[PDB]
Ligand binder design. Sequence first.
Ligand SMILES: NCCc1c[nH]cn1
Length: 145
Amino acid sequence: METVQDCENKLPPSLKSRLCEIRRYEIIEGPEMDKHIHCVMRALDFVYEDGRGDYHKLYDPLNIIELDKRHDVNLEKCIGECVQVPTSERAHVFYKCLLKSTTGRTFKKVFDLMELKKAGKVPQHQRYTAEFVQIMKDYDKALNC
Ligand SMILES: NCCc1c[nH]cn1
């Protein structure tokens, strides 16, 4: 599997210099970002190959971090939205939609946890704890972020 790190390494110079924005989930539009977000959402296994959000990769993890009937509603909304867009762009629309919804703040936790869990920096059962926040801070620091 290509990793999030591999995606970042292949960013065009124009986007590498905005890596810290990207890793803070700031939205940046345009076709190279459409490509990057597809890459990372694939790497963390959140979307299908055409870029469609996978309800089942997120419903449980979202609810375990923070139980909320809105996660269901938001997933359906954002999947509905991404399916209406060209595939070149379907991962990024899903991601943007999720971040703009009330589920956004919990999605960022699930994403951060999955990234570090795959990188072997934390155990598979790692929760979003104070220690985890510090672990991610140190992780980003080594990336110049
Ligand atoms: N841990 C956040 C990495 C990221 C967020 N958005 C894109 N890449």
